[PDB]
Design a binder for this molecule. Structure first.
Ligand SMILES: O=[P-]([O-])[O-]
Length: 165
């Protein structure tokens, strides 16, 4: 009866936007129910054959913006890759979209936090959401990245897709 298995750390972010860690074949029946058009994939490793066949069968486009998986305190998240990923995220034609990395905590958490900055969330609310997913693996460096990330190049893009105005 209870047969659907959302991927690791799965959540809805906004209308048409989801976050998780790396899906495996046990998660495919759940992800099929979301009618995804897009995956925003934030790891540099090649997408596994299993996952590629799932995207092909389901008509899902892969956007890969590979961010190296550094450990604190040697973390350097590249601004350009997050910027490129946000541009994909802000085009509602790409929705519904799943953002994922390995565990859905660090790279995924940074992209979502930068989206919340565009949505005018105060930093403590952004950090609280980040921390809820990252839990014991919360990194100060991810939150510092969000704090100083320059969103000026996006301020003109309307967000009519959102549940928030
Ligand atoms: O895979 P992730 O938790 O950056």
């Amino acid at each position: 009866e209870l047969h659907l298995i959302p991927p690791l750390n799965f959540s809805m972010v906004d209308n048409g936007i989801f976050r998780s860690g790396f899906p495996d074949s046990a998660n495919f029946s759940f992800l099929q129910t979301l009618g995804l058009r897009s995956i925003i994939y934030l790891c540099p490793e090649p997408y596994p054959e299993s996952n590629l066949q799932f995207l092909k069968s389901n008509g899902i486009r892969l956007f890969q913006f590979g961010i190296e998986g550094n450990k604190e305190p040697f973390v350097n998240i590249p601004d350009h890759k997050i910027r490129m990923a946000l541009k994909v995220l802000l085009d509602e034609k790409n929705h519904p979209v799943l953002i994922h990395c390995k565990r859905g905590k660090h790279r995924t958490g940074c992209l979502v936090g930068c989206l919340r900055k565009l949505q005018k969330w105060c930093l403590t609310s952004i950090f609280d959401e980040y921390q809820r997913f990252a839990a014991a693996k919360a990194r100060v460096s991810d939150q510092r990245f969000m704090e100083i990330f320059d969103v000026s190049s996006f301020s003109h893009i309307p967000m009519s897709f959102s549940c928030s105005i």
